Design an enzyme around this catalytic site. Structure first.
Site, short mmCIF file in Angstrom:
data_model
loop_
_atom_site.label_atom_id
_atom_site.label_comp_id
_atom_site.label_asym_id
_atom_site.label_seq_id
_atom_site.Cartn_x
_atom_site.Cartn_y
_atom_site.Cartn_z
N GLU A 45 0.80 -1.23 0.00
CA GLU A 45 0.00 0.00 0.00
C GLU A 45 0.83 1.28 0.00
O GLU A 45 0.72 2.09 0.93
CB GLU A 45 -1.01 0.03 1.16
CG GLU A 45 -1.85 -1.24 1.27
CD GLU A 45 -3.31 -1.01 1.64
OE1 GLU A 45 -3.62 -0.10 2.48
OE2 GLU A 45 -4.16 -1.78 1.08
N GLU A 84 -4.00 -9.03 -1.44
CA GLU A 84 -4.64 -8.88 -0.14
C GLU A 84 -6.10 -8.53 -0.31
O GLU A 84 -6.47 -7.72 -1.13
CB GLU A 84 -3.97 -7.78 0.66
CG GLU A 84 -4.13 -7.83 2.16
CD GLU A 84 -3.65 -6.54 2.77
OE1 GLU A 84 -2.43 -6.36 3.05
OE2 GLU A 84 -4.48 -5.65 2.95
N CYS A 104 -9.53 -8.31 2.67
CA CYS A 104 -10.13 -8.71 3.96
C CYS A 104 -11.54 -8.15 4.13
O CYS A 104 -11.84 -7.13 3.50
CB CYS A 104 -9.21 -8.34 5.14
SG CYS A 104 -9.10 -6.55 5.36
N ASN A 122 -12.55 -10.93 -9.93
CA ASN A 122 -11.16 -10.89 -10.25
C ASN A 122 -10.82 -11.87 -11.35
O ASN A 122 -10.07 -11.52 -12.28
CB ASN A 122 -10.30 -11.16 -9.00
CG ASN A 122 -10.16 -9.93 -8.11
OD1 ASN A 122 -9.09 -9.36 -8.00
ND2 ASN A 122 -11.24 -9.51 -7.49
O1 LIG Z 1 -6.94 -4.63 1.45
C1 LIG Z 1 -7.33 -4.07 2.72
C2 LIG Z 1 -6.36 -2.98 3.24
N1 LIG Z 1 -5.46 -3.49 4.31
C3 LIG Z 1 -6.21 -3.65 5.58
C4 LIG Z 1 -5.56 -4.68 6.47
O2 LIG Z 1 -6.46 -4.74 7.55
C5 LIG Z 1 -4.25 -4.18 7.08
O3 LIG Z 1 -3.96 -4.97 8.23
C6 LIG Z 1 -3.04 -4.21 6.13
O4 LIG Z 1 -1.86 -4.06 6.92
C7 LIG Z 1 -3.01 -3.12 5.02
O5 LIG Z 1 -2.29 -3.62 3.90
C8 LIG Z 1 -4.35 -2.54 4.51
#
Ligand SMILES: OCCN1C[C@H](O)[C@@H](O)[C@H](O)[C@@H](O)C1
Ligand SMILES: *[C@@H]1O[C@H](CO)[C@@H](O)[C@H](O)[C@H]1NC(C)=O
Ligand SMILES: *[C@@H]1O[C@H](CO)[C@@H](O)[C@H](O)[C@H]1NC(C)=O
Lengths: 497, 497
Positions: free
Chosen positions: A235, A340, A342, A370
Site C-alpha cells: 500500500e 490482499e 479482507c 477478479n
Molecule cells: O486490502 C485491505 C487494506 N489493508 C487492511 C488490512 O487490515 C491491514 O492490516 C493491512 O496491513 C493493510 O495492507 C491494509
C-alpha cells in the site's frame, strides 16, 4: 473422512469446530469418470463442500438458463490461491497444542484440505504484530551491519512456513511485502504517519533500502526458503496520508517508478535473487490504470516489473472493468495478482462474525470478479486470528477464515474458508480461465476454467435467496443439468476426454 | 466589516471563534471598474476570505501558468449552495443564546455571510435526530389521518428555516428527503436494517407512502413553506444492506423506477404540489450510470424525474469521469445535483477536527470536480454540530462547517465553512460554468463561471505546499498577475465591461 462439527454463534450460518483430536477433512481426491461430473456444494443451511456426482446428458431439451462453455476462448493462467503468514496468524496458530496446529495447517495446505499454494510474508512488522520493529533498527546503519531477523521470523513464521511446505503436495510459492523501512531511512522518522524514503531514487537511502530487500532474501535463503515474488511496497499510497496509524512508507507512482528503475530493479537483477519476480502497486485497485501508466510506460522501470498486485477492502464496491479491465488492455503481458483482501470492520458490525455467510459470499464474489478480469491469483490476509480479530497493536481488527480460540484449544472454520476452498482446492497453478456465456440475464456469478490436464472446473455462486435451475453446456461432452440453491456456492468438475 | 478571531486546537489551521457579540462578517459587495479585479483569499496559515483588489493590465509580466477565460464555451447553470437543517443542526443552533443564533444564521445566509440559498430538510427522523419518529407512527393508518408534524418540525426546524429566509440575500430553495417510512409499511417492521416497502408499486403500501409525501408538503405549506424539490428516498441502496443502522428504506434501481412511475410521480402530479421537482438516486455516485439507465430509460418513470441527486461520502471508490461524466453523456438534459456534500472522514481520525485545513481542501476540491463534471448544486450535510460531531442517536463520524460549544455560548467556523464560502458567496443561482483553459500542466484546481450580471468569477485552489505563480487572462479585459500560495484558496471577481 470427517464432516464439519457445526456451531452457531447467532449469525446467518455455522462454523466448523476443530480441535486437537478432530477436524473436518476431505478424502484423497478421485476424479469423476468420463461422462459424469463431480459437484462440491456449500450452503448457508450448513453443507460444507459436500461431494456428490451426476450424469452428463447428451441432449438438452430447452429452455431455461444455459451456461455455455467456450473452451477455445482462452484467457489468463492461474498462479494460485493462499493467505498471509503474519505475526498475528503465526502467534495464534502456535498458541494451540501441537496436534491442533497440524489439523489447522492441513486444512489450508494439504490435499485433505483446501490446498493453498501461496503464502504472503510480511517483511518485518505490520499492524498484525504485537510490536513495531524492522530488520535494521540501529539508526543510520547504511551498511546494514545490524541486519537480522527477530524471533517473529525465526521462531514463529519460518518454522510455520516449513511445516506448511511439508504438508503440501502442490509447489507452494512465497510472496514478500514490506510495510515500512527502518525509521532512519524515512522523512518523518517514524514507522507510521506521512513519510517516505529520504532524498531521491539513486541515492544512499534508496540503495540501502534496495539492499534491505537483498538482505531479507538472504536471511530467508539461509533458513532454506526461497521467494517467488516481492512487492515494491505494501500500500504505497498509505504513507502519503498524515496520521496514517500503522506501518507504512509513502510512494507516489512517480517515486515508485524511479525507485524500481534506479534502485530496486538493478539491485535485485545483480543479486543471487535475480529470479524473484517484482510486483508493483500492492494497493487498492482504484489506483489503476494510472499507477500502471506512470510505471510501465517507463521502459527503464518496465524491464524489472513482472506484475501488478492489487488490494481490496471487501466491505466496499467496484466497477472493475474501468481498473482491472483497462489495465489488462494496456498491459496484457503484465499479470494482475490479488495480494490482499479482507472483510472488515463495517461498524455497525463486529470485526469477527463467527458463521457469517455474507462474508463468505463476499470472498467468492470477489475471486470470481477478479477471475473474470484477468487476475491470476488471490491471496487472503491473515491466515488465522483470535475471536477479537487480532492481535493488532493498533486495534485495527478484521475477520479471518480461521479463528483460533486458545483458551479452549479450538479453532473455527468460517464460511470464508469454504468459499475460498471452492477455488483453491480445484484450480491448481497452470489452470486457464476460458469463456462462459449465459443464455439469459440471471442472478448467478460463474467462472469456467481448464485444469492443466484438460479437465473442466466451473464455480457457480448464487447470492439470491431463490434456487436457480441451470444447465451447463460443454460441446465436447454434453449437458450438466443442475440447480444452484439460493445462498450457495458449487464447484463442478468433469473430464472432457 | 469584522475579521476572524483565530483559535488553534492543535491541527493544521485555525477556526474562527464567534459568540453572542462577535462574529466575522463581510461588507456589502462592491462593483470595481473595468480593469480592476477582486481577490478573496483563505490560507492554511490563517487568512480568512480576506479582500484585496488589483489591476488587470494589457501587458503580461508573468511567465508561469496561464489560465484563460473562455466565456463562449458555456456549460451548466447553477442552482446553488446550502446545507441540511437536521434535528441535530437545529438543536445545536437553538442551544445558542438568541444574539449568537442570528450571527450563526447570518453567517450562512446573509450578505454579511456566505449566502446559502438551498436548505435540505429531512422528512422526519434520520441518524442526526435524538429519537426515532415518522409523521405517521400509528399503525395501519393508510389514509394518513393521524399524519402530523412533531415539535422537531414545528418548534425547531420550521422556525429556524423562517429565520434563515428572513436573513437571506437570495431566494432560498428547500429540498426535502425521507429516511424511512412508518415501519408498518415495511417488509421488516423496523425503522432501519434491510427492508423495503411491503408489496409492489401500485398497491396500497406504495400509494400510502406516496400520499405521505403530499401530506408532508401540505403540512409545511400550512406553515407557509413551499419546496423546490424532493428526492425519492435518501440513500435507497442502504436499505438493501442487512444490519444497516440508520433509518432507511431500501429500493433497488428497478423498484425506484416502478415506484416513481406508478405512485410517486402521478401522486405529486395530481396535487397542488405539481411544480415541486423530483430527484432520483440521492446516493453515492458509484451507483451511476447504472441507476440512471434503469430509471430514466422507462419513459413512464423519466417524465417525472427532473434530475439525479448524488452523495460524496464514497467518491473515492468512483471516479467522477466514469460516473458523473458518463451519466451526463447518457442523459444530457437531466441535471446532476449533489444532495449531501460531505465528507469522509478517515477511519483513524476523530469525528470533528477543529481547524483542519485538509477537510476544507476536500470540500473545495470536491465542489470543483463536481463543477467540471456538470453538477448544478450542493447541499452540505448538518449545518452545525457539537464538538463530538453530534447529537446522532447512532454514531458520530462526520464533521460540520460550524461547531457549536453551548457551554461557552460560542461557535467555531471551520476551514470547511470558508472553502464552501469561496463558492456559495460568489456563485448565485443562474450562474453559468464557462471554459477556463490551462496553458500547461499545473498543480492547481480551477473553475470559472459567469455571474448572471455578466461578471467573471474564478476559484483557484492550491493543494500543494508550493506557491504557484499564475496569470489569468480575460480576452475582453487583459491579464491578472497573481500568486496562488501553497495551501490556499482564492476567488477572483472582475467586471468584463
Ligand atoms: O486490502 C485491505 C487494506 N489493508 C487492511 C488490512 O487490515 C491491514 O492490516 C493491512 O496491513 C493493510 O495492507 C491494509
Ligand atoms: C473434540 O471435538 C469432538 C467433537 O467433534 C468431541 O467428541 C471431543 O470431546 C472434543 N475434544 C475436546 C478436548 O474438547
Ligand atoms: C466574544 O468574542 C469577542 C471577540 O473575541 C470578545 O471580545 C468577547 O470577550 C467574547 N465574549 C465572551 C463572553 O468571552
Amino acid at each position: 473422512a470427517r464432516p464439519c462439527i457445526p456451531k452457531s454463534f447467532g449469525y446467518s450460518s455455522v462454523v466448523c469446530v476443530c480441535n486437537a483430536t478432530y477436524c473436518d477433512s476431505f478424502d484423497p481426491p478421485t476424479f469423476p469418470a468420463l461422462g459424469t461430473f463431480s459437484r462440491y456444494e456449500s450452503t448457508r443451511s450448513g453443507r460444507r463442500m459436500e461431494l456428490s456426482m451426476g450424469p452428463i446428458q447428451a441432449n438438452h431439451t430447452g429452455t431455461g438458463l444455459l451456461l455455455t462453455l467456450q473452451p477455445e476462448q482462452k484467457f489468463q493462467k492461474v498462479k494460485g490461491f493462499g493467505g498471509a503468514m503474519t505475526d498475528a496468524a503465526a502467534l495464534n496458530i502456535l498458541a494451540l497444542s501441537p496436534p491442533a496446529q497440524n489439523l489447522l495447517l492441513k486444512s489450508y495446505f494439504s490435499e485433505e484440505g483446501i490446498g493453498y499454494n501461496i503464502i504472503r510474508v510480511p517483511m518485518a512488522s505490520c499492524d498484525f504484530s504485537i510490536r513495531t520493529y524492522t530488520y535494521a533498527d540501529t539508526p543510520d546503519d547504511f551498511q546494514l551491519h545490524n541486519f537480522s531477523l527477530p524471533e517473529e521470523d525465526t521462531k514463529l513464521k519460518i518454522p510455520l512456513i516449513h511445516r506448511a511446505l511439508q504438508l503440501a503436495q502442490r509447489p507452494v510459492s512465497l510472496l514478500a511485502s514490506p510495510w515500512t523501512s527502518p525509521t532512519w531511512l524515512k522523512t518523518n522518522g517514524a514507522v507510521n504517519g506521512k513519510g517516505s524514503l529520504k532524498g531521491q531514487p539513486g541515492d544512499i537511502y534508496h540503495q540501502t533500502w534496495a539492499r534491505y530487500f537483498v538482505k531479507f532474501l538472504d536471511a530467508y535463503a539461509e533458513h532454506k526458503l526461497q521467494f517467488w515474488a516481492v512487492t515494491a511496497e505494501n500500500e504505497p499510497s498509505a504513507g502519503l496520508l498524515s496520521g496514517y496509524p500503522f506501518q507504512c512508507l509513502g510512494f507516489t507512482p512517480e517515486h515508485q517508478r524511479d525507485f524500481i528503475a534506479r534502485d530496486l530493479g538493478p539491485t535485485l537483477a545483480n543479486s543471487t535473487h535475480h529470479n524473484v519476480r517484482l510486483l508493483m502497486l500492492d494497493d487498492q485497485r482504484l489506483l489503476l490504470p494510472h499507477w500502471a501508466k506512470v510505471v510501465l510506460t517507463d521502459p527503464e522501470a518496465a524491464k524489472y516489473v513482472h506484475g501488478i498486485a492489487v488490494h481490496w477492502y471487501l466491505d466496499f464496491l467496484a466497477p472493475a472493468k474501468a481498473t482491472l479491465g483497462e489495465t489488462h488492455r494496456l498491459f496484457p503481458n503484465t499479470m494482475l495478482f490479488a495480494s490482499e483482501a479482507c472483510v472488515g470492520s463495517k461498524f455497525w458490525e463486529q470485526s469477527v462474525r463467527l458463521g457469517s455467510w455474507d462474508r463468505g459470499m463476499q470472498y467468492s464474489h470477489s475471486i470470481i470478479t477478479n477471475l473474470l478480469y484477468h487476475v491470476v491469483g488471490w491471496t487472503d490476509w491473515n491466515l488465522a486470528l483470535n475471536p477479537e480479530g487480532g492481535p493488532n497493536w493498533v486495534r485495527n481488527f478484521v475477520d479471518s477464515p480461521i479463528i483460533v480460540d486458545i483458551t479452549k484449544d479450538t479453532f473455527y472454520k468460517q464460511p470464508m474458508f469454504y468459499h475460498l476452498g471452492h477455488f483453491s482446492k480445484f484450480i491448481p497453478e497452470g489452470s486457464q480461465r476460458v469463456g462462459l456465456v449465459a443464455s439469459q440475464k440471471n442472478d448467478l456469478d460463474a467462472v469456467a476454467l481448464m485444469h492443466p490436464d484438460g479437465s473442466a472446473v466451473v464455480v457457480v455462486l448464487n447470492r439470491s435467496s431463490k434456487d436457480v435451475p441451470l444447465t451447463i453446456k460443454d460441446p465436447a461432452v454434453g449437458f450438466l443439468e443442475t440447480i444452484s440453491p439460493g445462498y450457495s456456492i458449487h464447484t463442478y468438475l468433469w473430464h472432457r476426454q
